Amino acid sequence: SGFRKMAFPSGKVEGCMVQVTCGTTTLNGLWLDDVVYCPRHVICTSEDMLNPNYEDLLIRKSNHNFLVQAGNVQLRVIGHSMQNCVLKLKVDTANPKTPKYKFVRIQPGQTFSVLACYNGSPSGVYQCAMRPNFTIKGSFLNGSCGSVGFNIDYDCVSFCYMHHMELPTGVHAGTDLEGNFYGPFVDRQTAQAAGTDTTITVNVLAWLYAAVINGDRWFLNRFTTTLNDFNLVAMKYNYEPLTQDHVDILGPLSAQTGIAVLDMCASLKELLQNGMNGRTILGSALLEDEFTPFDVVRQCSGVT
């Protein structure tokens, strides 16, 4: 028992981290097979960042200008190309530590682990969710660009995020491994609005099921609700509308605990309307939304 914000073991990803330097800029790269992936803003100087013409900036660069180092050894760059907001540096050596991997575009509300890196060296690992507004609330400092987000299913690492920037609001923005930003963001130092965010209702309900499994049950009540009534409350409290698809995803947890999804919705409705009254749930004094139903089942079942 016990419930923690658990990240995937980072070993398979640590073996892929490299340092990429172009001119004066050093950031992280991800070495899979004979390709190193990194944010294209590595080719920018501070002056270029206000409105960079990435095509023109990349034309001034040659393979020998991209310094790629895997720990202590230098990699030889034999090709370079830009795909959306990422640079792909072809190297003459396949990474011997390349795990089985896939590139995936995660959906908002889904979670993943981040291996925060500086100078190609891993510093720490943490779990987070892709917010409904396509930002992440991470922990990144200058030099962390190119750090990646991922999930692991058995021996396969599905890479879903590469870190590009921190907006003035302190939130983080990045791309999939094909260089497409999540959300409306651009890799340019210009004002950028992140959309209105919402709380991930299905994840809060999953976390309430995790609380029941782990013995925190004080919030269970004698009430029930309907999807329509619950959604009126979700609207008022800026929660994502619950759909039948969400109810079905919560099916396994409902079966495990014997608590109907709509009965758990009535508990969540009362918590939204009354607050916690100074009490806690799984060590938290707020409603947690960065655990998916799959995360709860995985952590509560011991999937390796």
Next chain:
Amino acid sequence: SGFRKMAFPSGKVEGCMVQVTCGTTTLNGLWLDDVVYCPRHVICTSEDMLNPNYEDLLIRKSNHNFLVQAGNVQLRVIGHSMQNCVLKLKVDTANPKTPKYKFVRIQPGQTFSVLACYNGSPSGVYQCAMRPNFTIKGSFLNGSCGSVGFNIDYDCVSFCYMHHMELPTGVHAGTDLEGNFYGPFVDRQTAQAAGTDTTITVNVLAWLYAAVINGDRWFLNRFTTTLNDFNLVAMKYNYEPLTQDHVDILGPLSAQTGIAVLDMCASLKELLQNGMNGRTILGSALLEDEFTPFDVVRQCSGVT
């Protein structure tokens, strides 16, 4: 910016995890050099657990009864011995993935990462603190015994915890890598009181400094306090008494922010006496105590 409950990258430790089976019981072992370390309760049957005579139970076992498997390959056991509550199984092969390591006994209030494992396979990693009462609030299921806690300084892994049991209260107990329990616990299925726990004051203050560094400053006030006055409030709210040693450990964070430690104590005093009034600090609605001053400096400086 941003502040997360960050764990160390687990790769160096993943390379040390093995499965240990004795009779009917399977748990995790830690393979360093030519020794595999694991909880001695692996030699128990369910009936033995009420009052096991570990010396007598171990006498009925031979080297060939300890089945040690590192992933897919079987290890050959050439010696066995019990040291306190751990078994040390000498194997004929040194682990080629043995990182630079040390065995350390951590102090209460200190933090470490846990690589939760099942059947010798890593499942996830999370950060936690050794509570003042020598328990940990982890996330462990049956089969997680032998999972380890650790810290990493550069290329050296300091192992500090090995998981042994979950008490009826849902808290976790374990040993250092010499098999000595943290706290008053015994590896026996018998009633065991964990002492009165307290909140780790120096860690809460460190986390308030982390909040200021990351822009959450609403709790800063026009007040100051003394160590004596603060400690009267700490007593009332079951917080550890703050000492001059704690003030000195907070020195680097005080210098970085320009906020005197006793001024931060007055902010903490007001938060203890008034609560948060429905507000949050670094995404939390409660006062967080599982970040040490060193953790805050490390995360805020990007140490790899």
